[PDB]
């Protein structure tokens, strides 16, 4: 007879993966976290003195 | 219609081990080569190339003119 | 001899990372020499090398504490 | 003698799963909360 | 060493008793005599307030905080010198 | 100094730091090779339905397992120890500088000729000038002549600290009652940063080290002006 | 130690003992499958005839299943062994696991 | 030099200590201090395993110097065999302490 | 290992409850402290 | 009903009372050091003594009175005591390491010499030599006591054991007197620190060992030991030899070599 | 009855249960402390306060995780439950002393919590170095409370060690030599020897710290002719053997787990495993100054400590390769315990290897007191000692309780923890190489990206820890009673059923000499 | 049939691919027809039907090799649930960023970072490989 | 003195189910109760002292 995994495995995998990706993308990009990436290739140096 | 040939039946695990340990060895030497070329030699050459014609006074003068120093304006 | 003293040279008696005894010995040597000279009427100028060496090596606060203790009569090394 | 067997060789009851949930919650929860409250204690001094 | 004695035939209480009274206790009596000869107070040295001695980084938890546990006024000065 | 997303060591500023980088590359290669071989063999052991569960004879294989690693350890120890003794070799420094650790700042003493000493404190974040580095700048830098062998002597007047400058490969503990010695030789002018490297109480994070490496003539004039 | 032929002969002899008991049948098969090999047809033939003498049909089928299992991913071994055993299987009326539907998951 | 007044174990040992001492004197080992000596362990000559109940755990060190011990419960009744080496063991239940 | 079926089965719903209560027991007190940190600090 | 020879011990409150006495002693010391009070400490010391008393009382009940100490049990107690002594040797080893560390590399604060400037060591040939003769002599008398016991001689066991105890007490009184008479103190730098802490812990062990011998003395008076079974006596003799040997190392290291 | 049984115990299983409960509770405390660390470091700036509060948290984290979680669980917990069962003994040699080893731990923990409550806490590092830990720079009761906490934990473990050595030497069946006892038993006897020899030296050193703080001694104070470096020698003389104490029982459980889930009757190369553990134990006593390469010791001393430390890789390597040879040819059962053991073998290897990097005193000048050391020791502690503890716990839980865990939940738990610990510690290697110091409440801005990721990793570990509590609740809530366990012929601890009776081996096993 | 806890010391049944012949039969009690089947098994197995042979197998063994070695969908549940809890962890981090963390230091402001980057280049931070090595001092731009 | 060990062996082997720490009789119970009371009361007092010591008094 089909067990829990036969019946719900596909939904648990799909929705777990979707949720995980969505909420980490949100956390990583939408809430003001400063990752402090390299300035290399990114920042235009400005006169400081 | 036709019989099947007798396959090898003994030492199958040992044979698989021997083959792959040898493969692990081959890969290891292969990677050491990659690494000495892509990391170690690269580093020796970057440092040697940097210092080959390096002019420390000229470096200092550039820094001084950029205003970085307390002791040199 | 050695004028144009820059700093204290390597001393084979104190070849290791811990240089505490180097500072101490030179401080002692200077003051023992000075005592020997100020006494017998001679010149402290002959003690100069030890003075340069201990000055170079010794933390100011150590020299200063040792000087206070000599003045106090509580300096524990023999001079 | 003493009770033997599953659920009986332990100093806490597992007769009721909800009472057990409450006890386990107080137990692990008190351990986990203690450093936060000691931090609070140290901030609320000076 | 074989020490300098003799013995060993078999083993026993009798030999250890022999050793107790014939060697051990006489040795103690001799050291006791030696000690009683060199007893009587010595001539306490000038007080010098050396900074490596009479250490006080925290008051002692008894008395006035400034006396060691087995303070002897005759021979142990305070950080400030001997007592009156 | 470290830069954002840095994976490895700060660029070498001294010949000894340069030696440490190549020795690290050597050792890391071996580290990678062993950890990957272990991972691979694990996966190999676990990916077959073939079985052999009877008693296995151990002694032939334990020879390989002890001799190969013994060999690998010697191949690490040889360059490790060459560098160790290279670092210890006689220098003839041209100058001696002392640094005393304190809670929470460093003082410096250059007393070969004159009595020059000063305190060196972190620039508070609210006082940084634009472009300056949070937690790293000091009010009074340790100006030193470039391309010269310098003897650094390190101690403390209170608790333990440790005087470190990663780009020169330097780290010497600051111990009260002790004078520890290290040598410093910069191949380049510039600014070279370190941080207190022994836990020392409330502002351990906030007593950094900044060396300013310049030509001898500038160092002498700076020295004179600091008296 | 021993050649392959000597090992095989040992095992043939083991199962061929006329009055082998149930314990020895199980002990022999359970020990045998610990080795790095799929047993030669002549060994399995001797074990199957031991099953016959012990009136144990089910163990005969199990022995065929463990042959398949010991081959691992080498799918060519089991059908070869069954091929070599067909005269014995026919003679003793032993149905293979596949004939019994016992290869269905 | 010398008299008596110290009790002997014979006079004063009690409880289990005394039971072990009295049994040893008779060359018996009710409290399992000694390792039993193996028989040939055949079906005809099984290792005989005393017990005060109807089962006891046997550990079989199949060959001299094996580090692996094979453990199994031995029950009253027909002789059982070590699952690794086949040597025979038979339980012989009952009593202890005369 | 083999085992008997559960003597007191814990349904998916009961498990959601035990898991929620368990997580809340760790999260809420520490959460209350961290939320009020500034209150404690700037005090 | 067991058919092995090991001792299944009745459930006991003394581990808990011992553990709580450790809490009361340590929190008591803290209170004494920082909050000017001896109350917790006194309670801890009391419950500690009570725990020791009842626990070892029970061990005697289990062995002498109930017969649980089969040879297998005694053999475990032998190992236990030997391991305990090994742990105590390592504890002392840390204080000898401290002593050699400071004395082999005397720092400038000391005058750069050992003994430090201003330290006037005791004469190792006076009371310290007497103490050495005393503990060595007690090693001899305890051996006499052991042999008398094995040979079944009650009176001479008791005499020899009494002499051993008297010598322990003599050492303790001599040491107490030399602490009082010493011109240096535990605050006299690393000289006074190593001297008093090392010889102080040794003195505590002498008091512990003497107490253990006195327990054996009273148990002997009450006929507990047989000529073959007397592990409490052997354990006390081993511990007593340990205390002698630590003294000899202290005498050579601190009193003689460090003078 | 309850007090008689649980406060007055003389039973090795119940005392083992007590230790597991105590260790599990300590684990929650240590975990909260680890989260406060990573919350502080998870963004640049100051969250809690300056370095004092911060390092009180760091110091407590280490003491709790080491002395109250790892040691009690491994040695007190699994050692008490398993060692007497694995040698067919009726209990431990000193069943009543065993109980005191347990009961010293709540007061020790209380003392540690007191230290953090009073004054400003002990913000010293778990190494408690003077002069920071002295009476001027840490005036007041906190450090003394910490020393006393250590004193109680030390007595607990010393008496435990005496008990384990005696039990293992003296209470095996008369036919069983030491070379017929299982690897976990060997692991515990070697650990006990390490404890017996190392803790008394710690006790001497912290006692001399206590007297410098309170009786005006000057062991570590240059003003009296003392030396702060002397403290470090006495501490590390204990402290290096301590990390072998923390891993050896883990090695023992790993051997059993790997053998078991490979379907093998025995670990590969048994006597090499015994040799390896004894060699590691021995070499562990002669390498302590690799914790002091920057203090200013002579160059030949640093050459010796480098070389002697590196030798440890040889016997440790034999064990790793012998675990792999145990898997080889196995009928592999992918149980949650096996996943823990497999993760252990690999991640322990990585941590060991960064240990070998650090053994090199030349390179250690730059790596010492940086996050590279923190990354090394968390690979061997959070992914070595901890993975062995989780492996042993899930493997023997049915033996101890008589109930089964849900294996699917336990696999989910392993997956979450594996991601969290690697996310936490892997980037710390980069932070170390690039120079981030230890024991900092805040860091120059360049270190932000790795500290952020590391803190996010620590939250994933928190989720695993919370899920673990739920999983244990679910097992007791559902009451799936154990029926059959395989491989009992080579796993004696299972042979009396699940859970075994209160008294086992009342009639000892029968084992022939032959 | 039914396995009891009180039976732990008795030989037991196991389905293990490396222990093909377990210590006991799966079913030891026989009905009238199962007893007749065991009698028939004493005669030629060629006279047994397929159903009878299957029945004899199922009395001796619980699961066949194919059944006992079957794969499952468990990995899906495991990976999916693990990713869920990992996803849940991000909610904790979102809560922390919102309610616990304040503003990060002003040195992360975009203009501060541009100036600091220039000053780092002026001081030639990591000029051999790490940082300034990636700046082109001639073309005044990041190296391509 | 006379050897009275036999009387003590009878007393402590009496089949009365008492644990060894209480088997001497009523004074065992008294001493036990004193010890436990001092231990438990002392522990509560130590907790009071921590409470007291956990807050400033300057
Ligand atoms: C369980 C805990 C544990 C364990 C087992 C170890 C194991 C080892 N450790 Fe570690 N360590 C710590 C916990 C531990 N460590 C802690 C907590 C600290 C910090 C203390 C503090 O300051 O707070 C620390 C610090 C520490 C330092 C000090 C660094 C510094 O402070 O600057 C060093 C230096 O040598 C060191 C080295 C080693 C080595 C060589 C091993 C070896 O035992 C590892 C051997 C294993 C392997 C090598 C892997 C397997 C082997 C093979 C697969 C064979 C082939 C390998 C080779 C040929 C190399 N460790
Ligand atoms: C066993 C030891 C151990 C363990 C497991 C850990 C685990 C963790 N540690 Fe630990 N750490 C140390 C020992 C340990 N640590 C030590 C010795 C130091 C140095 C202290 C000093 O400098 O003075 C230190 C320092 C240290 C620092 C450096 C602080 C600094 O230098 O400023 C950091 C920062 O990230 C850190 C973080 C963490 C994290 C996020 C975890 C997480 O991985 C924790 C996650 C949770 C667990 C691993 C589970 C806990 C276990 C249970 C709940 C058991 C349940 C059991 C049963 C049911 C049987 N630790
Ligand atoms: C023959 C003498 C026998 C000793 C009996 C004397 C009484 C004190 C107790 C000593 C026991 C030894 C412990 C070690 C501590 C230091 C005391 C050293 C011995 C001693 O008694 O030293 C005295 C100082 O005592 C002082 O400070 C007083 C100190 C009293 C407070 C004790 C501190 C508690 C320490 C606890 C340590 C924990 C134990 C470790 C457990 C390890 C577990 C693994 C010396 O006196 P003084 O006036 O300085 O000089 C003499 C001048 N005429
Ligand atoms: C101010 C600070 C407070 C300090 C505390 C002061 C301490 C004083 C304690 C002195 C020690 C007394 C020990 C008494 C033990 C009596 C019980 C006993 O000796 O029990 C014996 C077993 O041995 C056994 O347990 C042997 C038991 C081992 C005892 C070990 C004793 C040393 C422990 C002392 C603690 C050390 C502290 C360290 C300090 C750093 C009983 O067996 P037998 O003798 O064979 O008898 C049976 C025959 O009769 C049969 O015919
Ligand atoms: C490091 C481990 C822990 C980190 C992750 C913690 C996740 C937090 C779980 C929720 O914690 C709660 O958060 C609420 C806010 O969401 C707080 O309510 C606070 O905020 C509410 C809305 O602002 C008010 O209604 C409440 O009164 C006020 O207490 C509440 O106190 C606190 O228990
Ligand atoms: Cu100064 Cu850390
Ligand atoms: O300690 O590694
Ligand atoms: Cu170490
Ligand atoms: Mg350091
Ligand atoms: Na004797
Ligand atoms: Na921070
Ligand atoms: Zn056998």
Author numbering:
A (entry chain K): 6 to 54
B (entry chain I): 1 to 73
C (entry chain H): 7 to 85
D (entry chain L): 2 to 47
E (entry chain G): 1 to 84
F (entry chain B): 1 to 227
G (entry chain E): 5 to 109
H (entry chain F): 1 to 98
Give the original sentences from the paper that presented this experimental model.
Bovine heart cytochrome c oxidase (CcO) is an enzyme that functions in the cellular respiratory electron transport chain in the mitochondrial inner membrane. In its resting oxidized state, it binds a peroxide anion at the O2-reduction center, which consists of a copper ion and a heme iron.
In particular, low-dose diffraction data were collected from CcO crystals using 30 keV X-rays at BL41XU, SPring-8. A highly sensitive pixel array detector equipped with a CdTe sensor (PILATUS3 X CdTe, DECTRIS) was utilized for data collection by the shutter-less helical scanning method. Maintaining the DWD at 58 kGy per data set by controlling translation-speed and frame-rate settings, we collected a diffraction data set at 1.9 Å resolution (dose estimation with RADDOSE-3D). The ligand bond length was further evaluated by fixing it during the refinement, and then varying it from 1.45 to 1.7 Å in increments of 0.05 Å to find the optimal value for describing the structure that yielded the optimal residual density map. Ultimately, the optimal bond length was determined to be 1.55 Å, which did not give large residual peaks neither outside nor beside the bond. This was identical to that in the damage-free structure obtained with SF-ROX. The final refinement model of CcO converged to a 10% minor component of ligand peroxide at the O2-reduction center, larger than the 5% minor component of the XFEL structure.
